[PDB]
Amino acid sequence: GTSQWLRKTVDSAAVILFSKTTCPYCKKVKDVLAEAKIKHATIELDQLSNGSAIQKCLASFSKIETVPQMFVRGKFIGDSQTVLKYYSNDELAGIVNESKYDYDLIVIGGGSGGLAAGKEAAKYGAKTAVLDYVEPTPIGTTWGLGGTCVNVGCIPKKLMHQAGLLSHALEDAEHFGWSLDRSKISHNWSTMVEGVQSHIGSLNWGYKVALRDNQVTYLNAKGRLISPHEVQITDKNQKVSTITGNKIILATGERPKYPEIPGAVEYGITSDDLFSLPYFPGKTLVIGASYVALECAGFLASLGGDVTVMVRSILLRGFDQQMAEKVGDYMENHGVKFAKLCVPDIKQLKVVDTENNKPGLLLVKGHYTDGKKFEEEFETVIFAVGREPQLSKVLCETVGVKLDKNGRVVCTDDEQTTVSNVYAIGDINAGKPQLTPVAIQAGRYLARRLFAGATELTDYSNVATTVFTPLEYGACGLSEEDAIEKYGDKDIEVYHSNFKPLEWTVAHREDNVCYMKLVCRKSDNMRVLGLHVLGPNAGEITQGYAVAIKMGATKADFDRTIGIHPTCSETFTTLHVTKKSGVSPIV
Amino acid sequence: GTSQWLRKTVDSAAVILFSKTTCPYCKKVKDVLAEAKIKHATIELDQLSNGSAIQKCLASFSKIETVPQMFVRGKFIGDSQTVLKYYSNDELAGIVNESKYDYDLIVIGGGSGGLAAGKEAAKYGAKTAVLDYVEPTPIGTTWGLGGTCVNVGCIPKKLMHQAGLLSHALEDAEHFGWSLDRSKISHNWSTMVEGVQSHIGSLNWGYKVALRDNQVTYLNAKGRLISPHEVQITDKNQKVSTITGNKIILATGERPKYPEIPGAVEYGITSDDLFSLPYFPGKTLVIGASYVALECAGFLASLGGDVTVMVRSILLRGFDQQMAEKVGDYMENHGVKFAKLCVPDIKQLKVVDTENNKPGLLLVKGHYTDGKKFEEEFETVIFAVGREPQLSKVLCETVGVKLDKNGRVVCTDDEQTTVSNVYAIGDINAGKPQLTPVAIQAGRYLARRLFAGATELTDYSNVATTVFTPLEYGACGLSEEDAIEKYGDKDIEVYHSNFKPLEWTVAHREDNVCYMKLVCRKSDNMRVLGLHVLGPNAGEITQGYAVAIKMGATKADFDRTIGIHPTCSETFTTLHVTKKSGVSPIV
């Protein structure tokens, strides 16, 4: 396998040096390259147990067995004498810049995965271009470099969640002795939006600066792959041209869906529009039941809004349903109205006021499963009914990249498509968790395999999540129902408990609402298959346990670890009530 | 070893039944015991790989080899026929209540460890008494059942820390769009104290109820062990008497120290007085540099107080000193004044006003190492210069319990003292981390070994901690300097990074102040020896990683785990900058 690995590494690396840490000839080559500003990968054979065999395999390309050996785009360039010869004759820059293609890497899509991949590739001498374009929403909203998370996703959504959490901080502060009157304080939507957007703008700019400082070419242009190595680009002035690249990474993400009902596209909005909305939403209907639907409904209500969520069947399909029910129950007790077993069939009553920055007014008609009609007025209607790629705008069908029935790219476990120089990362990679840290790990690990000879793959199993609803829900591993489906009910033990944060005591909040559980496999030493927690700071609670689950933690490992007091997370270290026992989990 | 274990178990268990889950004769004995309200331990031999051998060893006491076999205080009572015989003749209650001693267990001290031990022991039929008495402070402060943490420790200190955190929540809420003016809001100390004390009172009462519901005898009396099995008690009316017990658990904790300078006892206070203080402290001097000193100084300043800390040498001796310096630097930038390299030499200017509930006024004189004099007026002076047991008030020297040079009890790894029926748990156990979850685990695990045949020991290694200063500091494992001392500098690699909470962006708080590091051992697969984090919610961040460290996590385990976004804790999953490299950790 050593020989297979070396051949793949030489063929794909842009500029790579084989070396040993103790060789002065290697040092002199490194210094020459560093003086001429030639970036490159380095593999130190004396730090690999397999290095003596690698040194022998090198001779298949170079006909020598010594170090240093330097390669450019699949071709042996020289040993120490040869490299210094090129340098002395001002020949080196020309050799290390010679390519069949304009770029070693073209990334189509400048989001979480695509930016991480392009920056990492450039570190190893890959001449890289990042393409990004933001197709405007139906009402015309657009934004800058950085993708869905930075502009219309994790970042603004958690900042608005923080604004909602502070409403309860203001309430709590009275009980802890502070002299404010919460009932006389109001929230200004546009003041919050301006602060959120000023931070997003600093991220847009920071990404352009980072690309420039890594020598990456940034093009604000729509990309379309028309053959394995050719990308057609259309710029802001509609000028069309073609660039070529050796490796291609598709990283174009998804966009929100609309239901096919009259008025939906013309009068409703999505999460794409919400985070820069110039007017306050007012009385709002959220249609949908995804984590996006519930997170948005949740902070709108905490800011003081009149909020309804219209649910076709269940909440958070695909998540543990006991946990999802507890999430929704908390929201209903804290102001959110729910129209259950209900679907929509939208009429405009008032146009948005772009002068006084005030919302319009809409009539929503729908129906319930019991036959009753739904008819109610709202100032804003938000659709959160899923997301999808539109790869037909990115990818000519004749190139030969295989898609699945949902239109996502079918990849091997190293992100390779059915076209061997083309790779896909992030939300468009079929079957993978659709999360920002996953896309970043995929893109960075892929760049190292392509251009630095790395072997490490991304591990997509047991990736932890957090839903940032008013009471947050964190999880890692299997839901209880999926564990029982896989192993049978007799092989599953579930430990659980309610708890109360210490911070809730003086504030007079609820006793037996926060909740956690460990779903375990009896016949495998009580292995922890899934961990679930409903409570404040659930993302901070969950993260560290994801390392232990990755390592195969059992119930005994949780028991022998001592808790930190006073914390919410410490309740995981002393769990003892099983579901099979029927004993109540309440405190 | 099976035979040794069985003999120890029979001798010490109060009421114990040997059984198999599938035996109907065992079931009938369980039902009779449950009807007569006789609590007991149960060991199911068919759930132990060693059970066939245990069944044979039982014959050394009973001369039979069948199940069920029932034992009371070291004596075989009978098989199924014999037990039902006693029940039918109204003889059973008399047999299971027969003892040489008043109690199977006496616990001296009703705190974290002592309450946990007494409640667990009672579950297995041990007739238990818990003794608790609170010696008043010099000014007369006293409190109810539950020990140091509940009354004058973790619980009130974290609630007052929460009150201080809310000051910054009020400030932040303006930037997130809320219409309050922080500069017009004040804090009322006594309103906060009343709420904190109402919660503590609910815990005092809940413990008395829990003891009553477990059939534990609670005596509010000072205990003194005068021989291995005799405890002399003095009650609230000064009446003296003697009770006897089979096993004794010493769990009496520590109390604050004072420096030996004029005026210290008469005019200063300690943490024992602070948490129920009827007047606001006003301009305050904290003398000391322990986690107690810095936590108290920190929340007093966040509530709006004029606070000075007087430091003899370093902060947080025994903790990682880079981390301790960052903690103190944050406090100094946020209002706390520090009198460095300074010691005190206290005069009264005004007596405390017990009518208008206002503090007095004090003159503090001291001196610096450079020869300058310290002289300044303060309304309150708090000493936080360490804590100590006073076991000469608990333990007659003739009993034979060995103490160390600091006066703590010298124990084996199962908490046994040099007197074989006497055990020590919690803060008075020499050499152990002095923390509430440690005391609870020790007491509960000990009760199960004494009265239910358990074998599991408490693991005191790599127990995680959190200091609840204004910016919190969490840790698990070795400090960097201790790791280098143990293994040498060439064998240690340190990965580190600054970070900024997303919540701090819109609030305009500091860029490169939060900080984390992983201290690793190169020659052991980059094993993580210590983890350290300075930031919000540091206790929630740290707890879950303590399970992975207990399991032997390496740097590779941290790398392959995916982060949760956006969280502070996720920065641990992507660390790459080493200290040896000299690259800056800033963002």
Ligand SMILES: Cc1cc2nc3c(=O)[nH]c(=O)nc-3n(C[C@H](O)[C@H](O)[C@H](O)COP(=O)(O)OP(=O)(O)OC[C@H]3O[C@@H](n4cnc5c(N)ncnc54)[C@H](O)[C@@H]3O)c2cc1C
């Ligand atoms: C409301 C919401 C909240 C979320 N919250 C979280 C959260 O808390 N945590 C989390 O981990 N994940 C969260 N996510 C998911 C996260 O945003 C995505 O998983 C992540 O952004 C995926 O990144 P990506 O690189 O696959 O694509 P994207 O980030 O979508 O970036 C793709 C980019 O390519 C551009 N593009 C498309 N076609 C072309 C073309 N032809 N030419 C050029 N450019 C093109 C797009 O306009 C976009 O800029 C959230 C998502 C949403 C919608």
Ligand SMILES: Cc1cc2nc3c(=O)[nH]c(=O)nc-3n(C[C@H](O)[C@H](O)[C@H](O)COP(=O)(O)OP(=O)(O)OC[C@H]3O[C@@H](n4cnc5c(N)ncnc54)[C@H](O)[C@@H]3O)c2cc1C
């Ligand atoms: C200010 C402060 C803050 C702290 N914060 C934390 C924190 O955040 N987290 C943490 O884990 N730990 C914290 N601790 C430590 C924690 O309080 C102790 O580790 C824990 O209380 C130890 O419990 P214990 O059972 O050993 O003794 P204690 O809790 O002290 O209980 C012993 C009891 O025995 C009584 N007693 C003494 N002598 C006799 C006698 N002769 N007869 C009868 N009764 C007697 C005492 O009055 C007391 O009620 C803090 C401590 C302090 C002082």
Ligand SMILES: CC(CO)(CO)NC(=O)Nc1ccccc1
């Ligand atoms: C406890 C329980 C179990 O089902 C009711 O008994 N909760 C819900 O049903 N919560 C919910 C809230 C809003 C929308 C959908 C579900």
Ligand SMILES: CC(CO)(CO)NC(=O)Nc1ccccc1
């Ligand atoms: C960065 C550094 C390093 O020493 C100063 O250069 N910090 C301190 O010294 N912090 C500190 C604050 C209060 C009391 C004691 C120490």
